Amino acid sequence: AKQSMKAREVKRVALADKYFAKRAELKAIISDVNAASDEDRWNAVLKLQTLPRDSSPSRQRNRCRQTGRPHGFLRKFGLSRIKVREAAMRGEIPGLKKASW
Template identity: 65%
Template sequence: MKKGVRCWLRLIFHFGIEDQDVAKLSMINREVRRARVVAQYAAKRTALKEVIQDLNHSDEQRREAQRQLQALPRDASPSRLKNRCRLTGRPRGFYRKFGLGRNKLREAAMRGDIPGLRKASW
């Protein structure tokens, strides 16, 4: 089995995606890769940021830390991560508390899969 096919099968298994198009799978795959890069560089980024913000270091040390921080990959920044629905991979209408998009959250709530959540009625 080819490597790309294996990767997609892993994504389908991980996210529960069955009928998604290739474009959406590639975006989900990109987000997974970004999360891996963010985790890989997290310690280095925090160490460099501490040096930059610490006024006890010399200006030259702080400038060098700034250069090193800028030399890191763009995807190493946590702000580049996008929350996605665990079931569909949809990037918009995401509820952080549940990890689901609005459509799948509504379906799960109507089925009673989420304890304590019910449709509003007044």
């Protein structure tokens, strides 16, 4: 799916764990009300924007791991709907057989 689109996903994920899941303190408890309700929170709402436009966990598209498809994704397998069927008929997804109820 256009090689550079695969690279956008792998840069976004490296820059998000560079800053966030540690530098969430600016919104984690700086934006909730106690003695920090003065201009310090207002300094946070502005300081949270100078970190790069990436770095946020809500800009990851979650593509398929082999083909890079943006649609038809399944979080349980990490593959697109095409690749889970292509790989389930060969017996390579464990325990995943055809359901009949």
